[PDB]
């Protein structure tokens, strides 16, 4: 059962370095090449380079020969990619992927789940949660604005999981501040407003923030 387990998510500031790992199992490790490929958010896949797991020689993409080094530890069944002099533009998910042949001239038949790396000068911050208050077509929309946090991710549910129909939690956006902002809204019948309670459950694990905010109409 071929498996690729990548290290956890990483947050680093500009000019620093990061070293990610990829632990393989279920196949003989020295018989297949290992590859490192990244993807900036909403962007395409970009190959960083590869290592011949038997010999240990590598080659990298020219846009990266300066800063990337790929490594393996054969008794560990493990690959390592180290990126240095990090910049915000290096914020991306970094995949390791096993080659189809020992030698790079082959596709990838197995990709690891990915490791997210965020490069920012921002520090850990928990969000402020503001109401998107309903206003008095037969249905209304209310929501929560989860604002000024770092880093990703945030989770939002409504009424502790009980309200799911009509919910739309949006992808976060990154503001000039370096901080993230997200909104989650739900359509509900106007008739419900004053009697049904609507609470949004926000979780920002990186800052240990758990927050429940009741949303009601404004006076």
């Amino acid at each position: 059962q071929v498996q690729l387990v990548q290290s956890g998510a990483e947050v680093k500031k500009p000019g620093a370095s990061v070293k990610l790992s990829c632990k393989a199992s279920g196949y003989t490790f020295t018989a297949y090449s290992m590859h490192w490929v990244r993807q900036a958010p909403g962007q395409s896949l970009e190959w960083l380079g590869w290592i011949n797991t038997a010999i240990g020689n590598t080659q990298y993409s020219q846009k990266f020969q300066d800063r990337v080094t790929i490594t393996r530890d054969t008794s560990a069944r493990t690959s390592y990619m180290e990126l240095s002099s990090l910049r915000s533009g290096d914020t991306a998910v970094y995949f390791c992927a096993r080659g189809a042949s020992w030698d790079a001239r082959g596709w990838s038949g197995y990709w690891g789940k990915g490791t997210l790396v965020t490069v920012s000068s921002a520090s850990t911050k928990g969000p402020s949660v503001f109401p998107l208050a309903p206003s008095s077509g037969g249905t209304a929309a209310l929501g929560c604005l989860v604002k000024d946090y770092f880093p990703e991710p945030v989770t939002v549910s409504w009424n502790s999981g009980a309200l799911t129909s009509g919910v739309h939690t949006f992808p976060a956006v990154l503001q000039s501040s370096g901080l993230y902002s997200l909104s989650s809204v739900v359509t509900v019948p106007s008739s419900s407003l004053g009697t049904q309670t609507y609470i949004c459950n926000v979780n920002h694990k990186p800052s240990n923030t758990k927050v429940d905010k009741r949303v009601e109409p404004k006076s």
């Binding site: 395409s44 896949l45 380079g49 596709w107 209304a140 929501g143 739309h168």
Partner: protein
């Protein structure tokens, strides 16, 4: 290197109908020595890593359903999903492995085509608790519309704004195949309590006339 280029960038097809994606390589990825095309096709759903559908340009990976097939030679390639099911909604990448560096296409997003539906629009003024903090967030919600293209223009006292808004769009809805969009206009408390009329003008195919939703500061 070898530039990979897909067409079209985005593709909308009806349930059960045919989907066709094209790949052109800047140079040939055929080896006369081995008689193979060094080309693969991958599927990618948000959050998840890529999964091979096809390798050697025309062989289907095991476990992949037979409605996928690919063809072409040398520099021209074509992935076909003969009869689109809901689970086929994803991004598709082509990939040459003829020579290092590995390169990929830019990606073709494939969605379910449906009848055009107009967005329900809602506007949300900043909460007072956010206003204590010195910043103002006005939010526009465009709910459950199709297709994805939508213009949101923020107007303050009718002076249309620029450089101070940010957008975010839902993934195609599994149930009704619509999209939803959230737009956030941001000012300092100062600028906010200086103008009166805040409006969101939406332009969409299903709206015969551009809809504006609005409020006067002080409801």
């Amino acid at each position: 290197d070898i530039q990979m280029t897909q067409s079209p960038d985005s593709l909308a097809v009806s349930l059960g109908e045919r989907a066709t994606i094209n790949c052109k390589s800047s140079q040939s990825v055929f080896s006369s020595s081995t008689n193979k095309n060094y080309l693969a096709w991958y599927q990618q759903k948000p959050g998840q890593p890529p999964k091979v559908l096809i390798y050697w340009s025309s062989t289907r990976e095991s476990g992949v359903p037979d409605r996928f097939s690919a063809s072409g030679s040398g520099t021209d390639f074509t992935l076909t999903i003969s009869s689109l099911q809901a689970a086929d909604v994803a991004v598709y990448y082509c990939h040459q492995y003829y020579t290092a560096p590995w390169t990929f296409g830019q990606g073709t997003k494939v969605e379910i085509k449906r009848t055009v539906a107009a967005p329900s629009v809602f506007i949300f003024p900043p909460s007072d608790e956010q206003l204590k903090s010195g910043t103002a967030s006005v939010v526009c919600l465009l709910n459950n519309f199709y297709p994805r293209e939508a213009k949101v223009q923020w107007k303050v006292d009718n002076a249309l704004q620029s450089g101070n808004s940010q957008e975010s769009v839902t993934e195609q809805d599994s149930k009704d195949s619509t999209y939803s969009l959230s737009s956030t206009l941001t000012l300092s408390k100062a600028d906010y309590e200086k103008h009166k009329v805040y409006a969101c003008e939406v332009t969409h195919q299903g709206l015969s006339s551009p809809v504006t939703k609005s409020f006067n500061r002080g409801e």
